[PDB]
Write an enzyme that holds these catalytic residues in place. Structure first.
Site, mmCIF file in Angstrom:
data_model
loop_
_atom_site.group_PDB
_atom_site.id
_atom_site.type_symbol
_atom_site.label_atom_id
_atom_site.label_comp_id
_atom_site.label_asym_id
_atom_site.label_seq_id
_atom_site.Cartn_x
_atom_site.Cartn_y
_atom_site.Cartn_z
ATOM 1 N N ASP A 117 5.920 4.708 4.573
ATOM 2 C CA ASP A 117 6.850 3.705 5.078
ATOM 3 C C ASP A 117 6.887 2.438 4.226
ATOM 4 O O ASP A 117 7.530 1.460 4.623
ATOM 5 C CB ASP A 117 6.516 3.345 6.533
ATOM 6 C CG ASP A 117 5.152 2.696 6.684
ATOM 7 O OD1 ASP A 117 4.233 3.064 5.930
ATOM 8 O OD2 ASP A 117 4.994 1.820 7.563
ATOM 9 N N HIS A 118 6.218 2.428 3.072
ATOM 10 C CA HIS A 118 6.283 1.272 2.186
ATOM 11 C C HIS A 118 6.535 1.711 0.748
ATOM 12 O O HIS A 118 7.181 0.991 -0.021
ATOM 13 C CB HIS A 118 4.999 0.442 2.287
ATOM 14 C CG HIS A 118 4.645 0.057 3.690
ATOM 15 N ND1 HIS A 118 5.372 -0.860 4.416
ATOM 16 C CD2 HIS A 118 3.654 0.482 4.507
ATOM 17 C CE1 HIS A 118 4.840 -0.989 5.618
ATOM 18 N NE2 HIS A 118 3.795 -0.186 5.698
ATOM 19 N N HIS A 157 1.627 3.986 1.515
ATOM 20 C CA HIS A 157 1.997 4.814 2.654
ATOM 21 C C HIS A 157 3.498 5.091 2.621
ATOM 22 O O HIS A 157 4.274 4.360 2.000
ATOM 23 C CB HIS A 157 1.600 4.149 3.976
ATOM 24 C CG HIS A 157 0.203 4.466 4.417
ATOM 25 N ND1 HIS A 157 -0.471 3.717 5.359
ATOM 26 C CD2 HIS A 157 -0.643 5.460 4.055
ATOM 27 C CE1 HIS A 157 -1.672 4.231 5.554
ATOM 28 N NE2 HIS A 157 -1.802 5.290 4.775
ATOM 29 N N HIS A 196 -6.668 -1.198 5.489
ATOM 30 C CA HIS A 196 -5.607 -0.300 5.937
ATOM 31 C C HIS A 196 -5.473 0.893 4.997
ATOM 32 O O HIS A 196 -5.282 2.033 5.441
ATOM 33 C CB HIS A 196 -4.287 -1.062 6.042
ATOM 34 C CG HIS A 196 -3.165 -0.239 6.584
ATOM 35 N ND1 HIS A 196 -3.015 0.017 7.929
ATOM 36 C CD2 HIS A 196 -2.152 0.405 5.961
ATOM 37 C CE1 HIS A 196 -1.950 0.776 8.114
ATOM 38 N NE2 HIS A 196 -1.409 1.027 6.935
ATOM 39 N N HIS A 231 0.846 -1.187 0.000
ATOM 40 C CA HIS A 231 0.000 0.000 0.000
ATOM 41 C C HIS A 231 0.884 1.240 0.000
ATOM 42 O O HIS A 231 2.043 1.203 0.422
ATOM 43 C CB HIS A 231 -0.982 0.022 1.182
ATOM 44 C CG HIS A 231 -0.339 0.218 2.521
ATOM 45 N ND1 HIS A 231 0.189 -0.823 3.255
ATOM 46 C CD2 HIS A 231 -0.183 1.329 3.280
ATOM 47 C CE1 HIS A 231 0.656 -0.361 4.401
ATOM 48 N NE2 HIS A 231 0.445 0.943 4.440
ATOM 49 N N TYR A 290 -7.641 4.611 13.519
ATOM 50 C CA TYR A 290 -8.683 4.926 12.552
ATOM 51 C C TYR A 290 -10.033 5.033 13.248
ATOM 52 O O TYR A 290 -10.333 4.277 14.174
ATOM 53 C CB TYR A 290 -8.774 3.852 11.465
ATOM 54 C CG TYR A 290 -7.602 3.712 10.510
ATOM 55 C CD1 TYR A 290 -6.394 4.371 10.724
ATOM 56 C CD2 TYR A 290 -7.717 2.909 9.379
ATOM 57 C CE1 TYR A 290 -5.332 4.224 9.835
ATOM 58 C CE2 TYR A 290 -6.672 2.762 8.491
ATOM 59 C CZ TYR A 290 -5.484 3.416 8.720
ATOM 60 O OH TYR A 290 -4.456 3.249 7.821
ATOM 61 N N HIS A 310 5.299 -5.107 7.545
ATOM 62 C CA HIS A 310 5.966 -5.089 8.836
ATOM 63 C C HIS A 310 6.194 -6.526 9.271
ATOM 64 O O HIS A 310 5.214 -7.254 9.501
ATOM 65 C CB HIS A 310 5.135 -4.335 9.863
ATOM 66 C CG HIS A 310 4.978 -2.884 9.540
ATOM 67 N ND1 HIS A 310 5.933 -1.944 9.862
ATOM 68 C CD2 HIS A 310 3.993 -2.215 8.896
ATOM 69 C CE1 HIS A 310 5.537 -0.755 9.442
ATOM 70 N NE2 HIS A 310 4.364 -0.892 8.852
#
Ligand SMILES: CO[C@@](NC(=O)[C@H](C(=O)O)c1ccc(O)cc1)(C(=O)O)[C@@H]1NC(C(=O)O)=C(CSc2nnnn2C)CO1
Ligand SMILES: CO[C@@](NC(=O)[C@H](C(=O)O)c1ccc(O)cc1)(C(=O)O)[C@@H]1NC(C(=O)O)=C(CSc2nnnn2C)CO1
Ligand SMILES: CO[C@@](NC(=O)[C@H](C(=O)O)c1ccc(O)cc1)(C(=O)O)[C@@H]1NC(C(=O)O)=C(CSc2nnnn2C)CO1
Ligand SMILES: CO[C@@](NC(=O)[C@H](C(=O)O)c1ccc(O)cc1)(C(=O)O)[C@@H]1NC(C(=O)O)=C(CSc2nnnn2C)CO1
Ligand SMILES: [Zn+2]
Ligand SMILES: [Zn+2]
Ligand SMILES: [Zn+2]
Ligand SMILES: [Zn+2]
Ligand SMILES: [Zn+2]
Ligand SMILES: [Zn+2]
Ligand SMILES: [Zn+2]
Ligand SMILES: [Zn+2]
Lengths: 264, 264, 264, 264
Positions: B86-87, B84, B158, B82, B189, B223
């Site tokens: 951090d990815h 975001h 997510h 996805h 969320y 993660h």
């Protein structure tokens, strides 16, 4: 030995100091902070905003527009000096909340579309939320909103898309020619032999001459200190403001001195 | 009283701890950090990268690709879990330096195109350099590179664009079914009655069932702790890895507990 | 009285006449049609394509690349003269099937991104499938692929993004300076006082001088007749080719005659 | 043997037959042609347009908006059924001339951004000028303009981004629930085993049930014949209009018959 953390773009405290709307001319108001220019032009058919400042200034701009009796849906158009984070910061958020359109040249459009990332000189260090340009404008093109005509003058250098905006307003019926000229600085830029900008020096020089010839009775700049404005003192704010010639001449003397030190 | 300064996205130190390539299967290598997954798949016709980690991981990924004998121009395709920060952090920079293409579904594409800004839950807090998707892929679509077929499985939650990627590799000639499933967490969320995501709960529930049915002999997650991998211990890294059922069941028990506390 | 039907962009039959690859220099091949230029440059690290022709030429270009021993995944980069449908036609399709990147300046990028629609002079009449530029290049920037350096020279006029590309090849070890200059025509353009292009005449004039100064031993143009090439005759194709001076001088004499008739 | 010429998208004459505004409810008007729906909703804070028809309908839509006393700058928002050339045709041009924003889901946004090119089923055959979505909306999200709330209901199938729009209007003070449902047809689509849409049949089936449950007192469709409207007869236009159940049931019987013939 972990990789470094990300670093936030942090500016002087005065760049983020809110102020109440300061009238420039009959239709023109400064509604930004003490040290960052955001110009509101009120017409019979809507409002025009020139620059927005930092990313986190979006709420303050809308608060000031309300004080001027301008609802969010009355903002018709957003014009830009150049698409750096400290001038185009809130443009994305302002488009969502006002329904305004954005007009920029191709160079400012592509930089704005990638949120200032991959900057020719600053890399990814000063990224901000991306926005799209709805109308592409050419050098010398006129943008008319509510009878007020805005002419673009390309002045590449600080960014390839750097743009000066001129328009005629009034001061109690008497016409006043306003020129909002972009930055002419090169803070830490490699000037000579820059592989990302091989003709950078030719662009600056040609832009110094462009700023000199602008039809101008009153000059403003994205950073008010560049043209010796002082937004904090209210009435006498424009007391020591430079002319177009003084502004372009002072910028060129700093450009040449910097160009000479770069060879040293 | 100046407006607040911008805030950098800062993560755990271990998310930024470089590691040498850890072999998962014959063609599959973990080349990210200790706590962020970046998967390299080496084929006869080029390399495939799944996720890239943080923005500042771009150089480390290329260093590890070199160790695997993969030149920059050998990276053919970038797939994402996805979009975001951090990815998908380094995707923009990796496209510029490798000539790779990016394949994502429409939802991941629009989020990636605006650099994660205007996040449904995080606002503009976790912005990163924008990138464009070159190929839009549909649910269940197969992406073949060098004989290795990659099937996408949409698992919204997510993010709306969240995607699991499955492919069959080998372990010394013996086939091993790998499933790289996206996050099933909802950190802070609003779950019920979210005006930006009215059918969020239906998406998560349907995604829990999706992760259960995935063809999987070995599971990995963006993660590694989510699926109980431990990249730092090398050989025994996959020793305590969860199955697909265990992973989706543990995520759903946390979802329901969070959903119940939200009503309280 | 129904509204008119849509009208297809239909060109001369010879613009769509396939031909076998015609060698220009050691590394440079014409692989387009008889009357539309598409240049293939083969290097040790991949292939470079300059222009692609019409939208429906995508299959023929790939067929010719195969004849040259260039697989689709070997096409690394696409360069453009200008982003009109008869030169950038197949770029979108070629990106999907080859994994190539596209390099263009900001003006060609924004026009290519909207598929030629909203043309400054042609409206929506010559639309084609849109594509995205992966790399933005500046005037005088060098693009190196496999040791062959490609320098861009902006020559605005026919489009704002019009670009000439120069590179040095060899003719059996002896170096030959190739210049691929864009169109200098204005077919039916309003030249004087064009609200969509207020400084059009200044751009053409400056571009005439640009084409004259190009380092050039052998000149090529998107339309081969503009530089008096004849792709159909094979060997003697370059026999009557114009120099750079002859090409820019002939174009300027037609520009002035057209400018004078426009005032009449 | 030259390559084929480009082919224009040409439709039935009645799809391009202008008509005067036909009132649907107190705030809702049909302002398209006899056989293509374009819905105008007039509120106290502006106007909403749902679909625009063919590319060449842009002038007619603005002429009809004037007849309703709606100036161009009063059009606030454009909503879409799906981003095919015969429904999203003039969106790009309408954005330029009205200052409206466009709201669509991610799938309609990516298709609209590439002007309908690279269609899952139609290739590049039905291209139209591209436009950008300003706001991305999720399934079940409410869009409020001038007190009139518009709820989106995703119904994938005819396109991945297909969307039904519901809102409550009045009929002389008495509330009337309007549902504008998208097409449920698959003209020449490969239904089973489509590599560009592997779960196409699951999407259609789920969409048939979606259209059945829509809160609906009066149904409209992009093609008025699909719901048995007859715009040409004025008053009795809605006389034989289908219910939601009748519309989804008739579409599903044609889907199954087509699915069965496809296996034959
Ligand atoms: C990006 O924004 C400017 N630079 C900065 O904010 C910082 C910098 O470059 O130092 C910077 C850059 C990168 C970072 O990662 C962090 C910080 C810039 O565009 O140069 C801004 N804009 C202008 C302009 O527009 O002219 C002036 C005017 S010069 C001036 N102003 N105050 N003192 N001085 C000498 C410089 O600041
Ligand atoms: C955006 O990235 C995630 N969140 C964060 O980094 C931070 C957060 O949200 O706290 C955050 C958010 C906004 C900020 O302005 C600053 C920080 C996220 O997407 O939720 C990341 N991604 C995942 C995932 O992908 O599941 C987990 C797994 S849960 C977990 N991991 N470690 N501990 N826990 C409990 C959360 O962190
Ligand atoms: C768009 O492509 C060009 N024009 C056309 O194809 C047609 C036109 O304009 O007539 C046209 C335009 C709009 C339509 O809706 C339909 C057709 C153009 O860009 O001008 C092409 N490109 C060049 C160039 O690149 O110089 C020349 C060279 S002049 C020349 N070539 N052959 N005879 N002549 C006198 C003109 O044709
Ligand atoms: C793209 O637009 C539609 N198709 C077409 O216009 C043509 C087609 O496909 O035949 C077409 C396609 C590609 C071309 O290169 C040329 C033409 C489509 O989306 O299917 C339009 N939209 C709908 C819809 O929206 O349902 C119906 C309703 S079925 C119907 N309507 N009238 N008769 N029928 C049986 C089909 O027409
Ligand atoms: Zn700046
Ligand atoms: Zn600045
Ligand atoms: Zn995340
Ligand atoms: Zn994460
Ligand atoms: Zn042209
Ligand atoms: Zn041409
Ligand atoms: Zn359709
Ligand atoms: Zn249709």
């Amino acid at each position: 030995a972990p990789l470094p953390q990300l670093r936030a773009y942090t500016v002087d405290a005065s760049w983020l100091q809110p102020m109440a709307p300061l009238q420039v001319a009959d239709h023109t108001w400064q509604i930004g902070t003490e040290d960052l220019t955001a110009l509101l032009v009120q017409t019979a058919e809507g409002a025009v905003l020139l620059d927005g400042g930092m990313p986190q200034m979006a709420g303050h701009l809308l608060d000031n527009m309300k004080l001027r009796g301008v609802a969010p849906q009355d903002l018709r158009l957003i014009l830009l000096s150049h698409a750096h984070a400290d001038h185009a910061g809130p443009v994305a958020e302002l488009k969502r909340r006002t329904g305004a359109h954005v007009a920029a040249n191709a160079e400012t459009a592509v930089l704005l579309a990638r949120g200032g990332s991959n900057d020719l000189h600053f890399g990814d260090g000063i990224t901000y939320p991306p926005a799209s340009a709805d109308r592409i404008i050419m050098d010398g093109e006129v943008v008319t909103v509510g009878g007020i005509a805005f002419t673009a003058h390309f002045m590449p250098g600080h960014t390839p898309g750097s743009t000066a905006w001129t328009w005629t307003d009034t001061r109690d019926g008497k016409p006043v020619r306003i020129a909002y000229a972009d930055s002419l600085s090169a803070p830490g830029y490699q000037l000579k032999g820059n592989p990302r900008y091989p003709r950078l020096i030719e662009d600056y020089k040609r832009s110094f001459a462009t700023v000199r010839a602008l039809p101008c009775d009153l000059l403003l700049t994205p950073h008010p200190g560049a043209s010796n404005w002082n937004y904090a003192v209210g009435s006498k704010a424009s007391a020591e403001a430079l002319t177009c010639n003084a502004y372009a001449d002072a910028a060129e003397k700093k450009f040449d001195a910097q160009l000479a030190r770069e060879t040293a």
